Nucleic acid binder design. Structure first.
Ligand SMILES: [Zn+2]
Ligand SMILES: [Zn+2]
Lengths: 58, 101, 1451, 57
RNA sequence: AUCGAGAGA
DNA sequence: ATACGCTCTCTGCTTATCGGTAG
DNA sequence: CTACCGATAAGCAGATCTCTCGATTGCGTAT
């Protein structure tokens, strides 16, 4: 977490090893960032599927 | 039995004769089509590569397709094209009878 | 396929049938009982040794190992018969509409007999008889009906006997597409008539109904109290499989008479009775162990899914059998019924379970789910489309392609890695042992060598693990007399490597046309791991050398060798059949090298000239026709000899063109003007004379893929071989020239001068205010208004809110800024450039056509211009800012995406952002378009794969159905149509054309007088006539192509060709006379005919599919879908064009358009005020219109018509909407008389009025009951105002008057209604109206008008994108579509009426077409190409159109 | 279970999150070069929903 | 064998 | 501890309940 | 006065070039 690059090369990793990924079965994995709706904001929406949901639905 | 096969054979040959178009009234192209030329060359090459007697003189060549092309140039291909009409009628044109291009 | 093991027998046809339970019990090897597969195989299990050998266990049936055991079927005995999932719908339809009492159908017996007689007639080609039987209605009670049925039976018998006697049908019946359509329609109507019955007619005994809940379950409902009342005078429940089987067995054994014809399409010789046991599965047949071997993947052992489902069926069957023994205890012993009731309910549940298990084993959508046997044969991954219509192949290779100009243009460069693995079976002989023995001595490793030596008896010895001395011994014993008599008619084969003489077939996916798979010649190169391809093939394959790869198929028999070297080879495909244009030639470096070599500035000494000539042309390789290179006198004699590049071109032609022929006389142009060479130059005008380039420069237009260039002309005059040789020689020449005088581009090519830069700056300084001016024009504001005026900003805000106004603003601004861009580029190129042509290599590439274009040059050197996104400018955020940098509503061209920057100098960050937007859109569009048109080609080709050319010169489908009587009307090959109207070219090259045609050998085999006489008569008659319309003229003379065969009678030509030839000979009188020239041109027409056996259907499908990828009425792929993929009766944009009389002014035409176009009521409404008062719940719906002098002018609608529509339709619709909403919520005395009339006519109108003096208001009070809840009364009123029409003509949305294009003045209306425009003859030329809608024109004008509309529309999609597709393809498509008199389509709907069912089931919905083909016992004679490849028989099109016979010399 | 989620990408949830897709949540950080590796940690995805679609807005 | 990620034209 | 029973796409064909016309 | 045939609202079946790598059923149960 806080090792300087000298200690990082001493512990066999890399000079400027970066984080953000996991190791599972010796294969490195990353949880890819995804884009989602802005939180805590009511946004007006027009969508045909809203009317397709039922009857009398605008 | 034997008579049933005899009548089956007679019906088959009668149908064959009823389908054949005699040489005096065929109304197809006098030329040899590209497909006919290609298949006649391929079949003659197959035959000669299968140890058939040859008529033209070999010039040291060993490609059967080239020998077949030489025979077609010399009009020595002993083959007949049976052009089939849509209804099953057929005209038996000869290779020498047709004019290549 | 070994050619030394001939096969005598052949599969003539295959007929679908039903596997009965008796034969499978007879044919099976053993029954499978326990649902355990392994402990070693379980005896009596699925992997039993009677179903085939299994893992070194010899099969107990045939006693052979896993190699020699074909696998045998077994059967599992179902305890109860089960509903076959395939036939369940027919089972259900026949179960319904039947009498359980009388065991006959609930339809009248006489009507059933009528249907049976009609079907018996349709079994033969007797459509007319089966319709003349209907008019025998009695005529001419029970005795009368019996006599009528006897009359109908005797009529059918006599008609069939007459047909058999007179030859129209044999005893096997005549089954074609139209008789199939009639039979399907008759059977469909028979079933529909059956199912629409309520009470039995032979005995009025009401039968209980039935209900459906999917599969495996059929239930019946009980009659009602009033229904059983008739059942009281005639004197829910789960039905069982055995019960329904007994019911349908009785019905079928009673109505055999009609069933023998309902379940047959051709007469059945054996007269086998149709039985109801064929619809039930009492036995399941298990596929052999060979086809159900375990799926083992290393340690990952998995059980076969079929074994899983069969084991489940076995478990349920054994459970039922065990349940059948303890239930016997509760029936023989007098035990209570509760336990017996439980055991019986368990037995019923087990019946349902075994039925579902069988339905799972057969199908997987009726039972994540395990794929059954139906899913293995269903879709793209199914058995058909993945293992019969496309396969993996031996003797093929794949690699990356790299260019090579030192290889023949018809050759391929094959690495030694491929050349040692690929091999060809060459049988040894007495003339071949010279090289085959050498190859055997070489061995598998030393190219060229033999990997294997196939003995006479089929033994395949391998030389890989063999020593050199042993290989030499084998090669010495290679040619030996056969010691065995049984094998004395064979010779040993040698699997020698792929030499230089062998032929190979290349292919690059996607194969969008046949040109993308050609037969190249093999050239074994010494470096490895890349396929070397000339630059001529890049255009053919759409290939490239940035990572592209392509396959290399190696044919294994001399038949395929000849096919690839002659029919599929590279040089015989110089011209694409899509439009007849060439597709081969040099591309970039050769084009620029030729532009530099063939200028006046090029001079070469004697040694340089000789070196170039010998570099390009090499007689020892066969490149020279004279065996000795011949040169020319120099164009300069003093001070020292100097040749010219044009002399090098002349010498190249002189040495490759055959002698004893005149040189080419060609006059053409090139792409580089005469202002790019200076004042007075004439280098734009290419000029050949006796094969000597005397003027002009060779360009892209001459060598390359360009019509009427020197290479195309050489092709036409000297055959394809000479054009191929010329391409190869020019490739070698322009390669060696570019080595010594290399070509380059740099930074100085991209620079302008100081004056050019000042011009660009001065013009671009005028672009600052164009955006503001355009915005002011769009917002209807006077010019010279400030860019930040409040009213301008408000209007721009409105435009931002409204998408249409935004598009209008974008169009106007884009037009202005594109005008400015054009000013800049035309001013600054090439006048302002620093380095100029030909030194400027950038402009050299642009003008020469080697690479790039003037657009790219302008973008690099002047500016990038407007960035267009989705046909608009850059998107603008909700705040009016198109980017954070630009202030809201910025009226500036740069803000909207106008890039005043060039790639030479760089673009600002904002312009960089906009250009990234545009580039991203382009990448997206290319990614979509690369395969948006992939379904269309297969949809066309599935149906058109059999349409070929017959020896009658009539194109007709594979079965025999005639599509057209003559290909394109004239039987002219498109690849040979090029130089037919080139009469000047033919006159110039007359002597070489005569030499190539040789009429000396084309006289004794032709009739040269009768066709000419008939054509003269026809031309004379047509010249006398043709001043009268097409309907009034009497024919009296069919065109000469109809009477006389164009390929056998000289002079029989199309009316257009003859007219053009005569017009030429009459308009230019020019030493060879007109008689011999006309004779030569007619012989050329004879020799330009499409050969019998041509795959014209495939060619048309490919030529309408592949050009589609190059892509207010729908265009491109959507329109091609509407027309040729589904044939929609309702298209997105139905339009019909209306010609106008020449005496109608444009004002009158516009007035007619206004008076014809529809106008809704909402289009004259200003606003509506609803004053709702509940003080019994009323409404006062005041309506406000525009000014009369405004809406009457705009729409031609007056006060009287407005009052009429309001009084009649608007108020009525308002009342209807109000009452529907109310029901939904539960869950001047003339004016007085008018008001009273409206009140009386409508439900709850209390007051009414109208502005009878101005037409400005329509205020009427409405009232309702107080008990009703609150209504919106604004939304419904608005909807009603939208709905109600003021003046409309049915189906016409809007009639508009476009600008007169092509001279003619036409109107276009949205929506097709022909019979409604026939009434306006005073303004419309009623006999000239044409429409987009093919269905409407088919309905109101006939099949042929629909044919013309299809052709014109399917041509209008390509011709908008400047794509040329020959009308022969479109005519063939349309004549295949309307081949039944209806606007059919290319899909499974239009495919149903087809003789071959293999084709349809390979197409799609395989299960459905299989059930239909097995119910009718259809027998297809293996005619369609799909059926041929399913059964593995030689195709019918092309080289399979005939047969080859051997003339033995002994009887 | 966390290791299964990281190895497969499948979001096996008995209740379902507020997200649309159920699979492909974890990518394998490839090490072809440092440019690829560093760009793995700067990418943001719209979702697997829009890959199988026709609308291009 | 199946479904997920990605890559080449 | 272990073996074995088990939630945001495009068409076109087909079915259902309300309209009449006629014996 | 009811049977039969259209005729629009609803339901249901279906396709849209090559190549790597990674991952792989949950409990239950009777000893
Ligand atoms: Zn066996
Ligand atoms: Zn009955």
């Amino acid at each position: 977490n806080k090792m300087s690059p000298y200690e990082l090369v001493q512990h066999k990793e890399e000079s400027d090893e970066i984080g953000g990924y996991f190791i599972v079965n010796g294969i490195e994995k990353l949880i890819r960032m995804l884009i989602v709706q802005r939180r805590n904001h009511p946004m007006a929406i027009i969508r045909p599927s809203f009317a397709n949901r039922g009857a009398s639905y605008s | 039995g034997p008579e049933d096969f005899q009548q089956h054979e007679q019906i088959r040959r009668k149908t064959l004769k009823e389908k054949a178009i005699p040489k005096d009234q065929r109304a197809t192209t006098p030329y040899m089509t590209k497909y006919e030329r290609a298949r006649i060359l391929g079949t003659r090459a197959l035959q000669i590569s299968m140890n058939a007697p040859v008529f033209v003189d070999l010039e040291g060549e060993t490609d059967p397709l080239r020998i077949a092309m030489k025979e077609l140039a010399e009009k020595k291909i002993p083959l007949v094209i049976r052009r089939y009409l849509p209804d099953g009628s057929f005209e038996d044109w000869s290779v020498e009878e047709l004019i290549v291009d | 396929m070994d050619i030394s093991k001939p096969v005598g027998s052949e599969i003539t046809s295959v007929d679908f049938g039903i596997l009965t339970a008796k034969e499978i019990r007879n044919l099976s090897a053993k029954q499978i009982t326990n649902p355990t597969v392994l402990d070693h195989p379980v005896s009596g299990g699925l992997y039993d040794l009677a179903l085939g050998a299994f893992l070194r266990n010899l099969c107990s049936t045939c006693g052979l190992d896993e190699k020699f055991c074909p696998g045998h079927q077994g059967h599992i005995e179902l305890p109860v018969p089960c509903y076959n999932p395939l036939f369940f719908n027919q089972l259900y339809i026949y179960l319904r509409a039947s009498c359980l009492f009388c065991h006959h159908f609930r339809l009248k017996s006489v009507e059933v007999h009528r249907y049976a007689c009609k079907l018996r007639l349709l079994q033969y080609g007797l459509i007319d008889e089966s319709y003349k039987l209907d008019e025998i209605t009695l005529g001419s009670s029970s005795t009368l009906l019996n006599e009528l049925k006897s009359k109908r039976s005797e009529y059918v018998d006599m008609a069939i006997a007459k047909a058999l006697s007179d030859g129209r049908t044999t005893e096997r019946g005549s089954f074609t597409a139209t008789v199939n359509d009639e039979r399907k329609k008759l059977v469909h109507e028979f079933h529909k008539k059956l199912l629409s019955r309520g009470k039995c007619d032979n005995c009025g005994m009401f039968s209980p109904k039935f209900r459906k809940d999917g599969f495996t379950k059929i239930f019946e409902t009980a009659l009602n109290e009033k229904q059983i009342t008739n059942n009281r005078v005639k004197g829910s429940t789960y039905i069982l499989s055995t019960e329904v089987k007994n019911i349908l067995d009785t019905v079928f054994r009673k109505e055999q008479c009609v069933l023998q014809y309902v379940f047959h399409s051709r007469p059945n010789l054996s007269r086998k009775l149709v039985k109801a046991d064929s619809f039930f599965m009492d036995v399941l047949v298990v596929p052999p162990t060979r086809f159900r071997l375990p799926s083992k993947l290393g340690e990952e052992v998995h059980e076969n899914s079929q074994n899983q489902l069969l084991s489940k069926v076995l478990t349920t069957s054994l459970l039922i059998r065990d349940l059948n023994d303890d239930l016997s205890k509760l029936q023989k012993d007098k035990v209570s019924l509760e336990d017996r009731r439980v055991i019986f309910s368990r037995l019923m549940n087990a019946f349902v379970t075994i039925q579902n298990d069988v339905n799972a084993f057969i199908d997987s959508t009726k039972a994540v789910p395990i794929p059954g046997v139906k899913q293995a044969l269903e879709k793209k991954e199914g058995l058909f489309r993945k293992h019969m219509m496309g396969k993996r192949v031996n003797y093929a290779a794949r690699s990356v392609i790299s260019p090579d100009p030192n290889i023949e243009t018809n050759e391929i460069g094959v690495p030694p890695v491929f050349a040692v693995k690929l091999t060809y079976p060459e049988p040894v002989t007495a003339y071949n042992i010279a090289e085959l023995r050498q190859a055997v001595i070489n061995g598998p490793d030393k190219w060229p060598g033999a990997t294997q030596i196939q003995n006479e008896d089929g033994s395949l010895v391998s030389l890989i693990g063999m020593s050199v001395e042993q290989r030499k011994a084998l090669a010495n014993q290679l040619l030996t007399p056969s010691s065995n008599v049984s094998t004395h008619t064979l010779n040993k084969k040698v699997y020698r490597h792929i030499k230089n003489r062998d032929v190979v077939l290349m292919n690059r996916q996607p194969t969008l046309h046949k040109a993308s798979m050609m037969g190249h010649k093999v050239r074994v190169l010494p470096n490895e791991k890349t396929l070397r391809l000339h630059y001529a093939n890049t255009g053919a394959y759409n290939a490239d050398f940035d990572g592209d790869e392509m396959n290399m198929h190696f044919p294994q028999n001399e038949n395929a060798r000849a096919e690839a070297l002659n029919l599929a080879n590279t040089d015989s495909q110089y011209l694409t059949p899509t439009s007849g244009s060439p597709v081969r030639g040099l591309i970039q470096d050769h084009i620029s090298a030729g532009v530099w070599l063939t200028s006046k500035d090029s001079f070469f000494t004697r040694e340089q000239y000789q070196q170039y000539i010998y570099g390009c042309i090499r007689p020892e390789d066969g490149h020279t026709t004279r065996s000795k290179i011949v040169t020319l006198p120099p164009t300069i004699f003093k001070p020292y000899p100097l040749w010219t590049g044009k002399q090098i071109i002349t010498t190249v032609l002189l040495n490759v063109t055959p002698p004893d022929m005149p040189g080419i006389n060609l006059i053409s142009k090139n792409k580089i003007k005469n202002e790019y060479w200076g004042k007075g130059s004439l280098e734009n005008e290419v000029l050949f004379k006796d094969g000597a380039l005397l003027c002009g420069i060779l360009d892209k237009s001459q060598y390359g893929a360009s019509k009427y260039g020197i290479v195309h002309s050489l092709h036409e005059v000297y055959g394809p071989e000479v054009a191929a040789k010329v391409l190869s020689v020019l490739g070698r020449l322009f390669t060696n020239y570019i080595t010594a005088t290399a070509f380059t581009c740099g930074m100085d090519d991209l620079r302008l001068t100081a004056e050019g830069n000042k011009w660009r700056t001065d013009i671009l300084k005028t672009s600052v205010d164009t955006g503001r001016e355009a915005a002011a024009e769009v917002t209807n504001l006077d010019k010279d208004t400030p860019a930040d005026d409040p009213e301008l900003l408000k209007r721009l805000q409105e435009i931002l809110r409204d998408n249409n106004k935004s598009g209008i603003l974008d169009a106007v601004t884009s037009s202005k800024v594109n005008a400015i861009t054009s000013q800049v580029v035309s001013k600054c190129v090439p006048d302002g450039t620093m380095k100029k042509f030909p030194c400027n290599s950038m402009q050299a590439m642009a003008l020469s056509g080697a690479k790039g274009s003037n657009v790219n040059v302008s973008q690099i050197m002047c500016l990038l211009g407007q960035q267009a996104l989705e046909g608009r400018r850059v998107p603008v955020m909700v705040s009016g800012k198109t980017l954070p940098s630009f202030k809201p509503y910025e009226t500036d061209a740069m803000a909207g995406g106008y890039v005043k920057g060039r790639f030479y100098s760089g673009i600002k960050p904002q312009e960089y952002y906009f250009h990234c937007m545009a580039g991203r859109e382009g990448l997206i569009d290319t990614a979509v378009k690369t395969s948006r048109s992939g379904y269309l080609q297969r949809c066309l080709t599935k149906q058109l794969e059999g349409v070929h050319v017959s020896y009658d010169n009539s194109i007709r489908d594979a079965d025999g159905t005639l599509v057209q009587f003559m290909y394109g009307g004239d039987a002219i090959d498109i690849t040979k149509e090029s130089h037919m109207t080139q009469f000047e070219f033919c006159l110039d090259n007359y002597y070489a054309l005569l030499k190539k045609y040789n009429p000396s050998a084309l006289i004794e085999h032709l009739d040269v007088e009768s066709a000419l006489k008939y054509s003269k008569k026809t031309l004379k008659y047509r010249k006398k006539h043709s001043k009268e319309p097409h309907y009034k003229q009497s024919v009296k003379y069919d065109p000469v192509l109809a009477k006389y065969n164009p390929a056998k009678y000289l002079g029989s030509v199309s009316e257009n060709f003859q007219d053009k030839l005569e017009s030429f000979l009459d308009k230019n009188s020019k030493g060879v006379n007109e008689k011999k020239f006309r004779a030569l041109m007619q012989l050329k027409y004879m020799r330009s005919l499409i050969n019998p056996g041509e795959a014209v259907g495939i060619i048309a499908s490919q030529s309408v599919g592949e050009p589609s990828t190059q892509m207010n009425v729908t265009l491109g792929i959507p329109r091609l879908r509407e027309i040729v993929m589904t044939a929609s009766a309702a298209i997105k944009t139905p339009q019909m064009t209306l010609p106008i009389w020449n005496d109608v002014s444009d004002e009158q035409a516009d007035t007619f358009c206004k008076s014809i176009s529809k106008v809704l009521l909402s289009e004259v409404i200003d606003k509506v005020i609803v004053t709702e008062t509940t003080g019994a719940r009323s409404y006062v719906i005041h309506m406000r219109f525009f000014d009369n002098n405004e809406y009457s002018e705009e729409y031609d609608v007056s006060k009287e018509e407005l009052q009429n529509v309001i009084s009649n339709q608007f108020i009525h619709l308002l009342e209807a909407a109000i009452v529907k909403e109310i029901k939904k919520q539960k869950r001047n005395k003339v004016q007085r008389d008018r008001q009273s009339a409206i009140i009386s006519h409508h439900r709850f109108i209390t007051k009414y009025n109208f502005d009878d003096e101005s037409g400005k208001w329509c205020e009427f009070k409405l009232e309702l009951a107080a008990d009703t809840e609150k209504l919106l009364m604004v939304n419904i009123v608005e909807e009603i105002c939208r709905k109600s029409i003021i003046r409309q003509i049915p189906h016409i949305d809007r009639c508009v008057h476009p600008e007169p294009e092509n001279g003619k003045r036409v109107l276009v209306t949205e929506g097709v209604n022909f019979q409604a425009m026939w009434d306006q003859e005073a303004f419309i030329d009623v006999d000239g109206i044409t429409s987009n809608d093919v269905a409407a024109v088919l309905k109101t004008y006939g099949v042929e008008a629909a044919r013309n509309t299809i052709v014109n529309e399917i041509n209008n999609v390509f011709s908008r994108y400047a794509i040329s597709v020959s009308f022969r393809h479109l005519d063939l498509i349309a004549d295949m579509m309307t081949r039944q008199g209806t606007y059919l389509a290319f899909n499974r709907q239009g495919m149903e009426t087809s003789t071959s069912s293999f084709m349809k089931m390979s197409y799609e919905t395989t299960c459905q077409f299989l059930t239909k083909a097995v119910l009718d016992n259809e027998r297809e004679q293996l005619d369609s190409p799909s059926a041929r490849i399913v059964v593995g028989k030689l195709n019918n099109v092309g080289t399979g159109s005939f047969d080859v016979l051997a003339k033995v010399p002994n009887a | 279970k966390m290791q299964y989620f990281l190895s497969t990408g499948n979001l096996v949830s008995q209740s379902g999150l507020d997200l649309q897709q159920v699979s492909g949540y974890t990518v394998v950080a490839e090490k072809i070069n440092f440019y690829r590796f560093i760009s793995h940690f700067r990418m943001v995805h719209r979702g697997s929903f829009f890959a199988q679609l026709k609308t291009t807005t």
